[model samples]
Target chain A: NFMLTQSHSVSESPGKTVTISCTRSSGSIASNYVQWYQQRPGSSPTTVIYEDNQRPSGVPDRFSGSIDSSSNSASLTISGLKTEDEADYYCQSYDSSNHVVFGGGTKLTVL
Target chain B: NFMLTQSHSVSESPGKTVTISCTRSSGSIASNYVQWYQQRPGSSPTTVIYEDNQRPSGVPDRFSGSIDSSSNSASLTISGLKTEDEADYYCQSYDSSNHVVFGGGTKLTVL
Candidate 1:
């Protein structure tokens, strides 16, 4: 998403940790949970993180999350980048009780 | 039967109001609300409305929705349509305490 402020891809070796932060616009981030989704090209987006820092059941623990309410940031850290981890990541949040807003997704490629 | 059932194709004459309903198997209207997304081919899906009755910021009010607790259904109404409004519409629900589930989708044609 052009509006999304994304980090430059880190070309790290396997077993090394990598992280990406999706910093949303002030209007989009609420003081609550931040959600994340992964979308592979030619496929539908799937939930990766929910309720800000909780991974859905059955997901690998290597995918961890933390949110900075003060900075309005939802951070995702992939401890060990696997070939399967390559995909696009999108951040989302629910605001004003009903609206679910999504940031333009980021492309995560493992090199 | 699946947890979600969506109506078939819906088309309308210009300026007419068209509504599509998605019925969940079970849930309270208020606790388990529904959201709708508009996805055109080759583009990311955008949130149109959420929580059954509220429209997202920058979303036109012509798009509206409501939920029926007893029958477990949610309705989306598009009013004063334009040719641009034609797209594939999806109904999504966040369970009372779980992940969001998407409906198959509906195609709308404006005549």
Candidate 2:
């Protein structure tokens, strides 16, 4: 089974920027479509990034994703953090079995 | 936008069976692959079904999923429910707009 690892938690202040990383093992970043999702409390998760780096409509440019195939890692960076951004972020990747796998998720705290 | 609505909650006794439904309110359910996820309290979600009915390795056969495109609905069934199965369940599918969409989630309680 494929696996992904993400930072447990990260705290950032308003107007600050922070980066959270999701590393994948037993999978190739170039061949897999990596995605990032944001989940607010008591709400459903929303797609933030897809196909490695593309952002969906209404997602601000301050939020971005990237992948480094050589390092087998994908990352999400948020600029100008807001209180509303304090939520859980999860990274997802495809497994060889044609299924989706998720990282442990990183809890973001806006201070 | 694709909208997914799920059964609010369900409570089942141990060894019983429960089914959760996720309906596509305004999207093409047949055009996408449906996936189901299980989330334990304070933990990340794990994929239980992919592409409608396929399970990932290690998932018990008691968990099954199905899609009824005629009704624009997807369903997840859990048999032989145990206390450990009490958690939140979510249904996900891809939108033609190139994004992943998730249902509001169903809270499953094993009584």
Candidate 3:
């Protein structure tokens, strides 16, 4: 019965930085590596960060990830944001039994 | 990196069965575990199949997955389909380089 919750929406101006978080329920977030994906409208999702904080090949360095055990949450941070960065971001992790768990996702609006 | 290509659109009458195919561009489909997800409009995606064919808890048993090394592809079959099952379906697998590859996604419609 584990869940990953995230904010529904976040707004920021271009050139600014934004952080979307996924708070794990009932377990220490540090127990598993977290992955993040960005999905644009009318397109499938693409991995941005995985293995806690490693960016996939060809992904921008602006995307980063980290987990905080004290907060029991994982965070996806996007810096020097551009209009192209506007999309929905999701965080993913696995439970003790290796079942997949996903955050509700956050919509990033860059204007 | 190899690509996972899926049909762009699929439609079937309610109560009819449909099978979506994901063909790998290179490498054997059995080389790694493939996961399937369902994404509805304006919501985060959820895992429908994991570890190639394992269904997550609470998901309907009508959804099933299989990999064919003979064709270098994977298939997601939905039986006893309902209108509520309409959504975008995607398959994902990790590359040997640790890169996550996602299918272009198939738009499933129960018409």
Candidate 2 has a DockQ of 0.83
Interface RMSD of 3: 1.0
For candidate 2, the clash count comes to: 0
Instruction: Please give, for residues B1-111, the per-residue lDDT of candidate 2 as tens digits.
Output: 678899879888999999999999886777889999999988899989988998878899999999888888999999999898998999998777647789999999888
DockQ of each: 0.23, 0.83, 0.82
Residue pairs of candidate 2 with colliding backbone atoms: none
lDDT (C-alpha) at residue B100 in model 2? 76
> Considering every candidate listed, which one attains the maximal lDDT?
3
Instruction: After superposing candidate 3 on the true structure, give the runs of residues whose Cα lies further than 4 Å from its correct spot.
Output: B97-99
Q: What's the residue-level lDDT of A54 in candidate 1?
A: 83
Provide the lDDT at B67 for model 1: 82
Across residues B1-111, which tens digit of lDDT does each residue of candidate 1 receive?
225667887888888899988877655545666788886654456878776777877888899998877777888899998887887787887765657667767878887
Best model per TM-score: 3
Residue-level error in angstroms, candidate 2, position B93: 1.4
How close is every model to the real structure, measured as TM-score? 0.68, 0.92, 0.94
Q: What is the C-alpha lDDT profile of model 3 across B1-111, one tens digit per residue?
A: 799999669889999999999999998889888999999877788999999899988898999999988889899999999998999999998899656789999999899
> What's model 2's overall lDDT?
0.88
Could you tell me the fnat of model 1? 0.10
Root-mean-square deviation of every model? 4.8, 1.8, 1.5
Worst 10 residues of 2 chain A by lDDT: A92-101
For model 2, give the RMSD to the true fold.
Answer: 1.8
